[PDB]
Amino acid sequence: SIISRSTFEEMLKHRNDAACPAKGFYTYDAFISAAKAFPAFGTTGDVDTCKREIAAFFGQTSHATTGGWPTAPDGPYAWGYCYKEELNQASSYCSPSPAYPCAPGKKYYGRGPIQLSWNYNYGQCGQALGLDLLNNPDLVATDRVISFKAAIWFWMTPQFPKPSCHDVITGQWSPTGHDISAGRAPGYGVITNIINGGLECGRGWDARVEDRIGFYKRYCDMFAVGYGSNLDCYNQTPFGL
Ligand SMILES: [Cl-]
């Protein structure tokens, strides 16, 4: 009960349009089942903080899967969850390691709501959930429940030097001096940085960053809560340089 059926359907009300390749795949019942694997997701903090965690998770995943455009019906921030796999599937996304070795003939391109990528992410996730995602990465795009479990797993897991998205949005992250001079003050912008900052943050205005913010504001307005501070990353140095 971290979110109701009718709220879920209104948030994602164009995902089953004829133009959307993932039509029929994303369901309320499968999201609720995946959430049970991570009981602290959506239940941490006061009432306003729980609402902001739900709006931020669906804001970032909506951008990663959007089919919107500026004159779309009900505006561009009603078109999340239209896709479920990366458009260009040429690359294998292999970064060789003894810990998580790349399986022969397999490819670790983006799948599901968070567009999970690279062998080390499929590997760590599969270990945590007791699933064989390193040998069978397609499961993140073919099984309705596992697709959501992989996205929530990423949201909840720190990867040094990055904190978890969960910790940042619930107020459990405390920035160091190094973070402060890089412009990384706590808020929605730092979450964009964790997810894809190497390509999107610190260079000035960027259309992808604006689109992430638009979805988050719409969902916050639906729940009647304020946005918080520091929403963009136009002036933040990326993690890991
Ligand atoms: Cl948890």
UniProtKB/Swiss-Prot annotation:
Record's keyword terms, sorted: Allergen, Chitin-binding, Disulfide bond, Plant defense, Signal
Disulfide pairings: 20-82, 94-102, 201-233
One GO molecular-function entry: chitin binding
Keyword Signal found: yes
One of the protein's GO biological processes: carbohydrate metabolic process
Family statement drawn from the similarity comment of this UniProt entry: Belongs to the glycosyl hydrolase 19 family. Chitinase class I subfamily.
Function: Inactive chitinase-like protein that does not exhibit hydrolytic activity toward chitin. Binds strongly to chitin and possesses antifungal activity toward the fungal pathogen Altenaria alternata in plate assays. Inhibits the growth of Fusarium oxysporum on plate assays. Probably involved in defense against fungal pathogens through a mechanism that only involves carbohydrate binding.
Protein name: Inactive chitinase-like protein 1
Species per Swiss-Prot/TrEMBL record: Hevea brasiliensis
Origin organism lineage: Eukaryota, Viridiplantae, Streptophyta, Embryophyta, Tracheophyta
From-to range in the entire protein, with total length: 73 to 313 of 314
